[PDB]
Amino acid sequence: TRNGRDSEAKRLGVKRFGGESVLAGSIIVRQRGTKFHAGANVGCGRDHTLFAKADGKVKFEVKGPKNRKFISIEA
Amino acid sequence: MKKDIHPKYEEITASCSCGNVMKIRSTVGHDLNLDVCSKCHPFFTGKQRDVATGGRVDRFNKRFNI
Amino acid sequence: MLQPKRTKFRKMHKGRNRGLAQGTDVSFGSFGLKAVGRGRLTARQIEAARRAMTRAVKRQGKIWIRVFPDKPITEKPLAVRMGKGKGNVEYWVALIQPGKVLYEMDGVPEELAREAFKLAAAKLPIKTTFVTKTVM
Amino acid sequence: DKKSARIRRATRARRKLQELGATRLVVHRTPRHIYAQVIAPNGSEVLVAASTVEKAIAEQLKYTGNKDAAAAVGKAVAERALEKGIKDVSFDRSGFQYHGRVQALADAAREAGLQF
Amino acid sequence: AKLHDYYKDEVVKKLMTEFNYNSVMQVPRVEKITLNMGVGEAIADKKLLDNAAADLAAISGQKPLITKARKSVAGFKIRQGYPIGCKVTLRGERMWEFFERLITIAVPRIRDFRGLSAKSFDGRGNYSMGVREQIIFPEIDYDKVDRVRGLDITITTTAKSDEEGRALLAAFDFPFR
Amino acid sequence: GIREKIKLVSSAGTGHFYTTTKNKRTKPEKLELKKFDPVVRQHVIYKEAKI
RNA sequence: CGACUUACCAACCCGAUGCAAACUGCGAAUACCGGAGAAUGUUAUCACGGGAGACACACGGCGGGUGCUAACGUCCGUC
RNA sequence: UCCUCCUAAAGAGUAACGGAGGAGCACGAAGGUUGGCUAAUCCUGGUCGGACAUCAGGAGGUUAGUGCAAUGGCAUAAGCCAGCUUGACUGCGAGCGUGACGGCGCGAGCAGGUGCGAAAGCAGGUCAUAGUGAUCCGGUGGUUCUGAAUGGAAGGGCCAUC
RNA sequence: UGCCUGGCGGCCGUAGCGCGGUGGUCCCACCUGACCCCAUGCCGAACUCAGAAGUGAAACGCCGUAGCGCCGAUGGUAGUGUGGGGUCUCCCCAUGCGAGAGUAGGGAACUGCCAGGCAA
RNA sequence: UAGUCCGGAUUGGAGUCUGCAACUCGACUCCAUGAAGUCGGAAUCGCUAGUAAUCGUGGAUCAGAAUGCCACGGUGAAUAC
RNA sequence: CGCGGGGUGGAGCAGCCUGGUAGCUCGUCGGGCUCAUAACCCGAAGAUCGUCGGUUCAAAUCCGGCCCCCGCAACCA
RNA sequence: CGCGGGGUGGAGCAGCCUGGUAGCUCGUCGGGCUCAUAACCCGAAGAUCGUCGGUUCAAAUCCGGCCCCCGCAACCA
Ligand SMILES: [K+]
Ligand SMILES: [Mg+2]
Ligand SMILES: [Mg+2]
Ligand SMILES: [Mg+2]
Ligand SMILES: [Mg+2]
Ligand SMILES: [Mg+2]
Ligand SMILES: [Mg+2]
Ligand SMILES: [Mg+2]
Ligand SMILES: [Mg+2]
Ligand SMILES: [Mg+2]
Ligand SMILES: [Mg+2]
Ligand SMILES: [Mg+2]
Ligand SMILES: [Mg+2]
Ligand SMILES: [Mg+2]
Ligand SMILES: [Mg+2]
Ligand SMILES: [Mg+2]
Ligand SMILES: [Mg+2]
Ligand SMILES: [Mg+2]
Ligand SMILES: [Mg+2]
Ligand SMILES: [Mg+2]
Ligand SMILES: [Mg+2]
Ligand SMILES: [Mg+2]
Ligand SMILES: [Mg+2]
Ligand SMILES: [Mg+2]
Ligand SMILES: [Mg+2]
Ligand SMILES: [Mg+2]
Ligand SMILES: [Mg+2]
Ligand SMILES: [Mg+2]
Ligand SMILES: [Mg+2]
Ligand SMILES: [Mg+2]
Ligand SMILES: [Mg+2]
Ligand SMILES: [Mg+2]
Ligand SMILES: [Mg+2]
Ligand SMILES: [Mg+2]
Ligand SMILES: [Mg+2]
Ligand SMILES: [Mg+2]
Ligand SMILES: [Mg+2]
Ligand SMILES: [Mg+2]
Ligand SMILES: [Mg+2]
Ligand SMILES: [Mg+2]
Ligand SMILES: [Mg+2]
Ligand SMILES: [Mg+2]
Ligand SMILES: [Mg+2]
Ligand SMILES: [Mg+2]
Ligand SMILES: [Mg+2]
Ligand SMILES: [Mg+2]
Ligand SMILES: [Mg+2]
Ligand SMILES: [Mg+2]
Ligand SMILES: [Mg+2]
Ligand SMILES: [Mg+2]
Ligand SMILES: [Mg+2]
Ligand SMILES: [Mg+2]
Ligand SMILES: [Mg+2]
Ligand SMILES: [Mg+2]
Ligand SMILES: [Mg+2]
Ligand SMILES: [Mg+2]
Ligand SMILES: [Mg+2]
Ligand SMILES: [Mg+2]
Ligand SMILES: [Mg+2]
Ligand SMILES: [Mg+2]
Ligand SMILES: [Mg+2]
Ligand SMILES: [Mg+2]
Ligand SMILES: [Mg+2]
Ligand SMILES: [Mg+2]
Ligand SMILES: [Mg+2]
Ligand SMILES: [Mg+2]
Ligand SMILES: [Mg+2]
Ligand SMILES: [Mg+2]
Ligand SMILES: [Mg+2]
Ligand SMILES: [Mg+2]
Ligand SMILES: [Mg+2]
Ligand SMILES: [Mg+2]
Ligand SMILES: [Mg+2]
Ligand SMILES: [Mg+2]
Ligand SMILES: [Mg+2]
Ligand SMILES: [Mg+2]
Ligand SMILES: [Mg+2]
Ligand SMILES: [Mg+2]
Ligand SMILES: [Mg+2]
Ligand SMILES: [Mg+2]
Ligand SMILES: [Mg+2]
Ligand SMILES: [Mg+2]
Ligand SMILES: [Mg+2]
Ligand SMILES: [Mg+2]
Ligand SMILES: [Mg+2]
Ligand SMILES: [Mg+2]
Ligand SMILES: [Mg+2]
Ligand SMILES: [Mg+2]
Ligand SMILES: [Mg+2]
Ligand SMILES: [Mg+2]
Ligand SMILES: [Mg+2]
Ligand SMILES: [Mg+2]
Ligand SMILES: [Mg+2]
Ligand SMILES: [Mg+2]
Ligand SMILES: [Mg+2]
Ligand SMILES: [Mg+2]
Ligand SMILES: [Mg+2]
Ligand SMILES: [Mg+2]
Ligand SMILES: [Mg+2]
Ligand SMILES: [Mg+2]
Ligand SMILES: [Mg+2]
Ligand SMILES: [Mg+2]
Ligand SMILES: [Mg+2]
Ligand SMILES: [Mg+2]
Ligand SMILES: [Mg+2]
Ligand SMILES: [Mg+2]
Ligand SMILES: [Mg+2]
Ligand SMILES: [Mg+2]
Ligand SMILES: [Mg+2]
Ligand SMILES: [Mg+2]
Ligand SMILES: [Mg+2]
Ligand SMILES: [Mg+2]
Ligand SMILES: [Mg+2]
Ligand SMILES: [Mg+2]
Ligand SMILES: [Mg+2]
Ligand SMILES: [Mg+2]
Ligand SMILES: [Mg+2]
Ligand SMILES: [Mg+2]
Ligand SMILES: [Mg+2]
Ligand SMILES: [Mg+2]
Ligand SMILES: [Mg+2]
Ligand SMILES: [Mg+2]
Ligand SMILES: [Mg+2]
Ligand SMILES: [Mg+2]
Ligand SMILES: [Mg+2]
Ligand SMILES: [Mg+2]
Ligand SMILES: [Mg+2]
Ligand SMILES: [Mg+2]
């Protein structure tokens, strides 16, 4: 053949889901671009990884002018 | 405007041979001397004299005259 | 022989020809050849059935071809073992679900439009039927 | 349009400031008049507001739209803000280059006592 | 400032009667005069553009911007961010001073000037002249320049149509065909 | 290949150093960044040097 | 250099149709993650230690790659 | 060996000599940060100037751009200019993700000491995911460690790095 | 209390366009000047400063009009978990879930908190 | 010491004579026009003194139409081992 | 069918695997030389690079398909 | 890993250890030559030392780097 190569899989996706209790530091979403965005008490690292900045329950929202998905935390 | 970088934009007197004296401001020096202006240029007469040039039948009649 | 003029990808998966068709209504022309059966029409079959209609109705009338291939079919050479790559694209097919209007005619009599579609249907693999442009 | 270009030029500050959850001092400048208002960290309700459009301040000044007028508002807002109990705030320049009237307003707000 | 005051004192009036304008702001006013000089031959000789800038800086008051090439193209052998021409975007006070000097004493020195094109409008009142030589302006000394590199003048206005924008210029005794 | 590696050495202090890459052909002059020396515990002018 | 004729060939928008594993302005059933609560189950769970075997699988049904929608073929997912 | 897309059955993962493409670097500014900007393709008009340089307008609305493939992303722009600079910083690290493991990744906050901004703040390399190899054995500089009787030293160790 | 207009959020297109009409006492915008503060990689177009002669022309508001965009049922259709059956590269019963598209239509948004002016 | 006050081609216009007649197709004149050309590649020609070179001049044919032909005289060389 | 290498004025060769440049030798056309032809001398033209597509600011030169062309391999039973 | 030599017109050379004066040979255009061609002969057109830095009256030259050019023989993750 001419081809037959492939990269190792990156285990990207929503790790902790909506309504799930998480501890401060817990990664919520591993993903490439900002498919989800950082809302209240959530960070956004160099890898665009959304992580909890405070102990609470995860909350997914669909808010903004352009109608983007935001991840917030509420204690 | 930004000072230093630009050239010296000084006032000067334009005076053509027609008689139209006219102060202006430009990068020249001391004085000016012009040939023509917006007044005294042949465009209002120019178009009258330029368009009415053709005429072949009368040119023949001027030679024969009969 | 009908074929896409350039394509994104040379080779395509096999897939599965399931469900019902979408081009069911006789849209442009008066009459039409509807596919009762399920299957796939090669580029050769379409041209062969087009020639059989066109030559039956003569110069007069107008024909539409609602189906177009755009699905390449690979085939492995003779006396070649399995694997060592996907085979080479030989021919092109159009997947035909039940209900799909294949051809449509216009500007001909009803009795002589049928006789033409029989000759076309004879070339095709799929079981077909005659349909008229109804209202709504 | 100019306005729209000023809004999106400001937006980055606003959105960064609402994420922190801080009490912002918005300052809307205008050819005639200069406005200022302290807004609660939620963003909706206003706690303190002052401007040269207010006759209480307009009656005193020479002209409503200059550095000395901006200082008079900048003093006023901060003078109310301390009575309400506000002290630690942020300063939303609101798409206006921090230089003239808004700088005078901010400096007057600092010198009045509003610690930010 | 002479043509500037002429606009306000006269012309402001003359145009009101033609198109029965509701307000004084409806009348077209002249916004900016943009002198361009796409020298182009600066690919070979780098100084040749510095000579053109010296000529634009003479013709206008202010010093020109050296315009970079927007995109790379093979047809002329140029690349992204290469200095290819000069421009001056003069407006306000010196604009009216230049606009007088253009029509009153520069146009008349155009070689065999018979009439300027009245059909040279953009469909939105913005006029565009193109002068062949530099010598037509009296700011350039004769034994200084050694190349006939023309510029092009572009008068930008607030009019919404070329017919509406023609009267504006025509009202300044602008020589049309 | 091409882009070699260098040793940014501290001026004022102990022989602590950083290491970075550098293109030597395009940039023939030497670096002079102002990085943190942790032995002195201070920001110091770190000059370029070879390994 | 002034310009007429024309058995004539297909643009980008219009309206009407199709098609797509590597197209998506939409979009299920399921499956998966978390919490709440009954009841049921020989703790079924997870944790640490002692011993292993095993790491040639087969076919059948569903989703598929491959082959010819060939093979008691081949390769995966799932029972 | 590594990265991207599909195959992959809407969590993760998932094979074949299945289908298509890439990588083995680049960069002292192409990093940091404050201040500004906003794109392709046209249609017009315009000195040479043409099918295409530069200017002016309009219509467009991201059709572009992103150091390099693809996918996901980007207007608050992560795109494009600009001014100061060295956070491409040392010691840590709550907690998570991903690994059979060796490993790999993300990370608020803390201590020290810095840039930038008026500050709010931001900054522990670059839109993200490729740019890479374990140990052993040596080399180089350092060091509050060892120092085969005792002082040293060699050789070790520990740091940093090849 | 209403009528106005600003600032600032909630909501993100039933919230946007095209179209037609309008507002200028304030408010807002163009505007007026540029010794200055500061500004253009040229230009007071920007940004900035000082002002009040004009104006509501453009902008922005604001009210109208379905030319578009958008929202959008019901019934059906397609898929489909579970269990069964076929004529078994396809489908069909039983039972649950049930779109997309397209119709009937809805539609010129709706509200918070200060702040100023105007008929009360 | 310049494509020049060098060259004077080429063209537009206005004419003059001859001649039945000047557009194909004459000559000359005036006005404007102002080209190639900066001493010529391989080659190559004539010329041994009033000759070569160079300046004008006339005639024949001829209504008109020479830069040709045939004649005439001005200045007048170099070189021939 | 696998595997390298090719395809450039009329001929044979460079330039091609390091992207912007088209040379060399004959032949051809024009003029010389000769009584003439050859030889010889002096000028001149002549190839968008197999073809169709990409990538790119730009392709003879990079990459892909397809049409000829050489060289190599198609073995154990 | 090194100590060493070596670095000029387009290129192959020397000259470079013994600081004040960069040669020499192929590429170079005009001659003279001959009814002519080849030769042969004569003169012309080009580097202030790859390049940057210290001292001293004078620095390719004395001394340090770079870009490198290597001769080699060593080279055991
Ligand atoms: K598995
Ligand atoms: Mg694989
Ligand atoms: Mg992958
Ligand atoms: Mg894999
Ligand atoms: Mg592996
Ligand atoms: Mg970070
Ligand atoms: Mg499939
Ligand atoms: Mg279908
Ligand atoms: Mg349909
Ligand atoms: Mg094979
Ligand atoms: Mg910013
Ligand atoms: Mg008031
Ligand atoms: Mg310091
Ligand atoms: Mg057609
Ligand atoms: Mg349509
Ligand atoms: Mg897919
Ligand atoms: Mg799909
Ligand atoms: Mg739709
Ligand atoms: Mg969606
Ligand atoms: Mg649902
Ligand atoms: Mg369920
Ligand atoms: Mg559960
Ligand atoms: Mg649980
Ligand atoms: Mg539970
Ligand atoms: Mg529970
Ligand atoms: Mg309970
Ligand atoms: Mg228990
Ligand atoms: Mg447990
Ligand atoms: Mg367990
Ligand atoms: Mg055990
Ligand atoms: Mg095994
Ligand atoms: Mg196995
Ligand atoms: Mg076994
Ligand atoms: Mg198996
Ligand atoms: Mg089986
Ligand atoms: Mg199956
Ligand atoms: Mg099978
Ligand atoms: Mg059996
Ligand atoms: Mg099997
Ligand atoms: Mg998948
Ligand atoms: Mg998956
Ligand atoms: Mg799944
Ligand atoms: Mg497996
Ligand atoms: Mg590869
Ligand atoms: Mg690197
Ligand atoms: Mg910079
Ligand atoms: Mg940054
Ligand atoms: Mg528009
Ligand atoms: Mg793009
Ligand atoms: Mg791409
Ligand atoms: Mg950046
Ligand atoms: Mg950016
Ligand atoms: Mg500083
Ligand atoms: Mg510095
Ligand atoms: Mg500095
Ligand atoms: Mg680094
Ligand atoms: Mg990384
Ligand atoms: Mg301390
Ligand atoms: Mg600290
Ligand atoms: Mg500082
Ligand atoms: Mg500071
Ligand atoms: Mg701070
Ligand atoms: Mg950052
Ligand atoms: Mg970057
Ligand atoms: Mg990147
Ligand atoms: Mg990467
Ligand atoms: Mg080993
Ligand atoms: Mg060791
Ligand atoms: Mg040693
Ligand atoms: Mg020591
Ligand atoms: Mg210690
Ligand atoms: Mg000791
Ligand atoms: Mg000791
Ligand atoms: Mg010791
Ligand atoms: Mg002992
Ligand atoms: Mg002792
Ligand atoms: Mg001892
Ligand atoms: Mg002792
Ligand atoms: Mg030691
Ligand atoms: Mg050691
Ligand atoms: Mg230790
Ligand atoms: Mg609105
Ligand atoms: Mg309107
Ligand atoms: Mg209107
Ligand atoms: Mg009105
Ligand atoms: Mg009106
Ligand atoms: Mg008032
Ligand atoms: Mg102005
Ligand atoms: Mg202004
Ligand atoms: Mg209006
Ligand atoms: Mg209007
Ligand atoms: Mg209303
Ligand atoms: Mg209505
Ligand atoms: Mg209606
Ligand atoms: Mg109605
Ligand atoms: Mg209902
Ligand atoms: Mg079943
Ligand atoms: Mg079933
Ligand atoms: Mg049953
Ligand atoms: Mg039965
Ligand atoms: Mg059966
Ligand atoms: Mg329904
Ligand atoms: Mg629906
Ligand atoms: Mg719908
Ligand atoms: Mg309808
Ligand atoms: Mg209706
Ligand atoms: Mg409304
Ligand atoms: Mg209402
Ligand atoms: Mg209230
Ligand atoms: Mg001279
Ligand atoms: Mg000439
Ligand atoms: Mg002359
Ligand atoms: Mg010439
Ligand atoms: Mg010449
Ligand atoms: Mg001569
Ligand atoms: Mg000769
Ligand atoms: Mg003579
Ligand atoms: Mg004579
Ligand atoms: Mg005679
Ligand atoms: Mg003669
Ligand atoms: Mg050649
Ligand atoms: Mg010949
Ligand atoms: Mg050929
Ligand atoms: Mg491209
Ligand atoms: Mg080429
Ligand atoms: Mg030796
Ligand atoms: Mg002779
Ligand atoms: Mg080794």
PDB file of all heavy atoms in Angstrom, chain G residues 46-50:
ATOM      1  P     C G  46     -15.187  -3.837  41.173  1.00  0.00           P
ATOM      2  OP1   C G  46     -15.157  -3.072  39.899  1.00  0.00           O
ATOM      3  OP2   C G  46     -15.101  -5.319  41.128  1.00  0.00           O
ATOM      4  O5'   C G  46     -14.027  -3.314  42.132  1.00  0.00           O
ATOM      5  C5'   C G  46     -13.460  -1.996  41.991  1.00  0.00           C
ATOM      6  C4'   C G  46     -13.167  -1.387  43.345  1.00  0.00           C
ATOM      7  O4'   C G  46     -14.151  -1.826  44.323  1.00  0.00           O
ATOM      8  C3'   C G  46     -11.829  -1.747  43.969  1.00  0.00           C
ATOM      9  O3'   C G  46     -10.759  -0.970  43.434  1.00  0.00           O
ATOM     10  C2'   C G  46     -12.096  -1.465  45.440  1.00  0.00           C
ATOM     11  O2'   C G  46     -12.061  -0.095  45.781  1.00  0.00           O
ATOM     12  C1'   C G  46     -13.525  -1.996  45.589  1.00  0.00           C
ATOM     13  N1    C G  46     -13.622  -3.420  45.981  1.00  0.00           N
ATOM     14  C2    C G  46     -13.105  -3.815  47.218  1.00  0.00           C
ATOM     15  O2    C G  46     -12.565  -2.968  47.945  1.00  0.00           O
ATOM     16  N3    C G  46     -13.188  -5.116  47.582  1.00  0.00           N
ATOM     17  C4    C G  46     -13.789  -5.999  46.780  1.00  0.00           C
ATOM     18  N4    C G  46     -13.859  -7.268  47.188  1.00  0.00           N
ATOM     19  C5    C G  46     -14.334  -5.621  45.521  1.00  0.00           C
ATOM     20  C6    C G  46     -14.229  -4.333  45.164  1.00  0.00           C
ATOM     21  P     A G  47      -9.270  -1.575  43.358  1.00  0.00           P
ATOM     22  OP1   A G  47      -8.397  -0.566  42.700  1.00  0.00           O
ATOM     23  OP2   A G  47      -9.353  -2.946  42.792  1.00  0.00           O
ATOM     24  O5'   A G  47      -8.847  -1.689  44.891  1.00  0.00           O
ATOM     25  C5'   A G  47      -8.467  -0.527  45.652  1.00  0.00           C
ATOM     26  C4'   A G  47      -8.044  -0.920  47.047  1.00  0.00           C
ATOM     27  O4'   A G  47      -9.146  -1.568  47.738  1.00  0.00           O
ATOM     28  C3'   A G  47      -6.912  -1.936  47.153  1.00  0.00           C
ATOM     29  O3'   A G  47      -5.630  -1.356  46.923  1.00  0.00           O
ATOM     30  C2'   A G  47      -7.110  -2.456  48.569  1.00  0.00           C
ATOM     31  O2'   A G  47      -6.602  -1.606  49.577  1.00  0.00           O
ATOM     32  C1'   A G  47      -8.636  -2.543  48.636  1.00  0.00           C
ATOM     33  N9    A G  47      -9.152  -3.858  48.249  1.00  0.00           N
ATOM     34  C8    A G  47      -9.790  -4.227  47.089  1.00  0.00           C
ATOM     35  N7    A G  47     -10.124  -5.494  47.051  1.00  0.00           N
ATOM     36  C5    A G  47      -9.673  -5.995  48.263  1.00  0.00           C
ATOM     37  C6    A G  47      -9.721  -7.280  48.833  1.00  0.00           C
ATOM     38  N6    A G  47     -10.267  -8.339  48.230  1.00  0.00           N
ATOM     39  N1    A G  47      -9.171  -7.444  50.058  1.00  0.00           N
ATOM     40  C2    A G  47      -8.618  -6.382  50.662  1.00  0.00           C
ATOM     41  N3    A G  47      -8.511  -5.127  50.227  1.00  0.00           N
ATOM     42  C4    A G  47      -9.067  -4.999  49.009  1.00  0.00           C
ATOM     43  P     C G  48      -4.583  -2.061  45.925  1.00  0.00           P
ATOM     44  OP1   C G  48      -3.591  -1.036  45.505  1.00  0.00           O
ATOM     45  OP2   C G  48      -5.345  -2.805  44.887  1.00  0.00           O
ATOM     46  O5'   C G  48      -3.840  -3.107  46.871  1.00  0.00           O
ATOM     47  C5'   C G  48      -2.987  -2.661  47.942  1.00  0.00           C
ATOM     48  C4'   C G  48      -2.986  -3.651  49.084  1.00  0.00           C
ATOM     49  O4'   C G  48      -4.343  -4.047  49.421  1.00  0.00           O
ATOM     50  C3'   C G  48      -2.279  -4.972  48.835  1.00  0.00           C
ATOM     51  O3'   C G  48      -0.865  -4.826  48.933  1.00  0.00           O
ATOM     52  C2'   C G  48      -2.882  -5.845  49.927  1.00  0.00           C
ATOM     53  O2'   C G  48      -2.302  -5.655  51.203  1.00  0.00           O
ATOM     54  C1'   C G  48      -4.342  -5.386  49.898  1.00  0.00           C
ATOM     55  N1    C G  48      -5.189  -6.213  49.013  1.00  0.00           N
ATOM     56  C2    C G  48      -5.598  -7.473  49.462  1.00  0.00           C
ATOM     57  O2    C G  48      -5.251  -7.849  50.592  1.00  0.00           O
ATOM     58  N3    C G  48      -6.361  -8.248  48.655  1.00  0.00           N
ATOM     59  C4    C G  48      -6.708  -7.810  47.443  1.00  0.00           C
ATOM     60  N4    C G  48      -7.465  -8.603  46.682  1.00  0.00           N
ATOM     61  C5    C G  48      -6.300  -6.534  46.959  1.00  0.00           C
ATOM     62  C6    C G  48      -5.543  -5.778  47.766  1.00  0.00           C
ATOM     63  P     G G  49       0.110  -5.484  47.836  1.00  0.00           P
ATOM     64  OP1   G G  49       1.288  -4.590  47.676  1.00  0.00           O
ATOM     65  OP2   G G  49      -0.695  -5.854  46.638  1.00  0.00           O
ATOM     66  O5'   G G  49       0.640  -6.787  48.580  1.00  0.00           O
ATOM     67  C5'   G G  49       0.320  -8.101  48.104  1.00  0.00           C
ATOM     68  C4'   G G  49       0.175  -9.050  49.266  1.00  0.00           C
ATOM     69  O4'   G G  49      -1.125  -8.874  49.900  1.00  0.00           O
ATOM     70  C3'   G G  49       0.231 -10.514  48.869  1.00  0.00           C
ATOM     71  O3'   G G  49       1.590 -10.917  48.772  1.00  0.00           O
ATOM     72  C2'   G G  49      -0.632 -11.161  49.942  1.00  0.00           C
ATOM     73  O2'   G G  49       0.028 -11.321  51.181  1.00  0.00           O
ATOM     74  C1'   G G  49      -1.759 -10.134  50.047  1.00  0.00           C
ATOM     75  N9    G G  49      -2.773 -10.260  49.001  1.00  0.00           N
ATOM     76  C8    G G  49      -3.109  -9.315  48.059  1.00  0.00           C
ATOM     77  N7    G G  49      -4.053  -9.711  47.250  1.00  0.00           N
ATOM     78  C5    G G  49      -4.364 -10.990  47.685  1.00  0.00           C
ATOM     79  C6    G G  49      -5.315 -11.922  47.193  1.00  0.00           C
ATOM     80  O6    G G  49      -6.103 -11.796  46.246  1.00  0.00           O
ATOM     81  N1    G G  49      -5.295 -13.104  47.924  1.00  0.00           N
ATOM     82  C2    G G  49      -4.469 -13.365  48.987  1.00  0.00           C
ATOM     83  N2    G G  49      -4.603 -14.572  49.558  1.00  0.00           N
ATOM     84  N3    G G  49      -3.579 -12.505  49.458  1.00  0.00           N
ATOM     85  C4    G G  49      -3.580 -11.346  48.763  1.00  0.00           C
ATOM     86  P     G G  50       2.081 -11.728  47.488  1.00  0.00           P
ATOM     87  OP1   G G  50       3.543 -11.957  47.619  1.00  0.00           O
ATOM     88  OP2   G G  50       1.543 -11.063  46.274  1.00  0.00           O
ATOM     89  O5'   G G  50       1.345 -13.121  47.682  1.00  0.00           O
ATOM     90  C5'   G G  50       1.487 -13.825  48.927  1.00  0.00           C
ATOM     91  C4'   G G  50       1.013 -15.243  48.781  1.00  0.00           C
ATOM     92  O4'   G G  50      -0.403 -15.337  49.089  1.00  0.00           O
ATOM     93  C3'   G G  50       1.105 -15.827  47.389  1.00  0.00           C
ATOM     94  O3'   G G  50       2.451 -16.096  47.044  1.00  0.00           O
ATOM     95  C2'   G G  50       0.156 -17.003  47.513  1.00  0.00           C
ATOM     96  O2'   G G  50       0.678 -18.110  48.216  1.00  0.00           O
ATOM     97  C1'   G G  50      -0.987 -16.342  48.280  1.00  0.00           C
ATOM     98  N9    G G  50      -1.947 -15.715  47.380  1.00  0.00           N
ATOM     99  C8    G G  50      -2.046 -14.391  47.029  1.00  0.00           C
ATOM    100  N7    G G  50      -3.008 -14.159  46.177  1.00  0.00           N
ATOM    101  C5    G G  50      -3.564 -15.408  45.940  1.00  0.00           C
ATOM    102  C6    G G  50      -4.652 -15.788  45.116  1.00  0.00           C
ATOM    103  O6    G G  50      -5.330 -15.082  44.363  1.00  0.00           O
ATOM    104  N1    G G  50      -4.897 -17.158  45.192  1.00  0.00           N
ATOM    105  C2    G G  50      -4.139 -18.053  45.903  1.00  0.00           C
ATOM    106  N2    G G  50      -4.528 -19.336  45.844  1.00  0.00           N
ATOM    107  N3    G G  50      -3.151 -17.706  46.706  1.00  0.00           N
ATOM    108  C4    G G  50      -2.912 -16.380  46.667  1.00  0.00           C
TER     109        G G  50
END
